[PDB]
Design goal:
mainly beta; Laminin; blood coagulation factor; serine proteinase; Protein inhibitor complex; 4 strands; hydrolase
Length: about 55
């Protein structure tokens, strides 16, 4: 458990080890937060989110 194998590399979603070191990304409808790890929804009904309202 080094990079992506260690707690998903601290990524919210997609994790990939590129030339060593972690690189996170997000599904369509999300944008990688400034921390390069979190995924922020682009609209009102982002994918994979149970509808609260």
């Amino acid at each position: 458990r080094k990079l992506c194998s260690l707690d998903n590399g601290d990524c919210d979603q997609f994790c990939h080890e590129e030339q060593n070191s972690v690189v996170c990304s997000c599904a369509r409808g999300y944008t990688l937060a400034d921390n390069g790890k979190a995924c922020i929804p682009t609209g009102p009904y982002p994918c994979g989110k149970q509808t609260l309202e």
